Amino acid sequence: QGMSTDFDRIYLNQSKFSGRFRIADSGLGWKISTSGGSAANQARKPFLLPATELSTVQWSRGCRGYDLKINTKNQGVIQLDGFSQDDYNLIKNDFHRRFNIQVEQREHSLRGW
Amino acid sequence: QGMSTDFDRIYLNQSKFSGRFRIADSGLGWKISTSGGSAANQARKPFLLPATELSTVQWSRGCRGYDLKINTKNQGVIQLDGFSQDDYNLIKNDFHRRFNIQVEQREHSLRGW
Numbered sequence: 001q002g003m004s005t006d007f008d009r010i011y012l013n014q015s016k017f018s019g020r021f022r023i024a025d026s027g028l029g030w031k032i033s034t035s036g037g038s039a040a041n042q043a044r045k046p047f048l049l050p051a052t053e054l055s056t057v058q059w060s061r062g063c064r065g066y067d068l069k070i071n072t073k074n075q076g077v078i079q080l081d082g083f084s085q086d087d088y089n090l091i092k093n094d095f096h097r098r099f100n101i102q103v104e105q106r107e108h109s110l111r112g113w
Numbered sequence: 114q115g116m117s118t119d120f121d122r123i124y125l126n127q128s129k130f131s132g133r134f135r136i137a138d139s140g141l142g143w144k145i146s147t148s149g150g151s152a153a154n155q156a157r158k159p160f161l162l163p164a165t166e167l168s169t170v171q172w173s174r175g176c177r178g179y180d181l182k183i184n185t186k187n188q189g190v191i192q193l194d195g196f197s198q199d200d201y202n203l204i205k206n207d208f209h210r211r212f213n214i215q216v217e218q219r220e221h222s223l224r225g226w
């Protein structure tokens with residue numbers, strides 16, 4: 001749809017359901033994405049995190065693939081995982097441009113050597 | 114050994130190896146614990162995080178069991194996982210007494226309701 005940057009099959013805080021993660025100028029969103037089409041998917045409500053609540057963001061190792069661990073002003077650290085190594089460049093650019101946040105690279109133990 | 118509070122089979126940042134996690138007055142430690150006895154275990158060096166680097170700590174959902182996500186002054190967010198629900202009370206008490214840190218309970222979505 002062309003405004004937000006979207007990623008499918010992402011998990012929020014080790015959720016059993018996967019969902020779609022969206023990066024918008026307004027902040028972040030995540031919504032359960034499943035089967036049943038317009039029954040089950042239509043009742044679902046999004047998790048919405050306003051950009052004002054973002055403080056730091058790191059790209060690190062998830063349970064599934066790579067993750068973002070996102071520290072917030074009022075809601076602790078939120079985890080999104082299920083990313084591919086391929087996703088990093090896009091994520092880095094989006095967080096810089098939309099939020100002026102530099103994503104920290106902390107996904108292996110040789111970082112900073 | 115009676116000074117530190119120790120937990121076995123804990124993983125650091127989704128490490129392939131598990132190790133022993135130790136909570137001491139001086140800060141946190143983690144060291145790979147494996148087989149071979151005094152060959153492989155003896156060469157291993159610990160990860161050491163001085164108490165001065167601790168800022169916030171939350172108890173949340175790991176890849177394995179429950180986790181701590183620990184925000185540090187200079188090293189981003191560190192994850193320890195592999196904890197049982199049983200571990201929480203001890204952890205809460207140790208972080209309060211040793212560091213004056215209140216562990217945030219953020220391990221399910223009904224927290225704060």
Ligand SMILES: [Cl-]
Pocket residue numbers: 003004023024025026
């Ligand atoms: Cl947008």
Ligand SMILES: [Cl-]
Pocket residue numbers: 116117136137138139
């Ligand atoms: Cl001690």
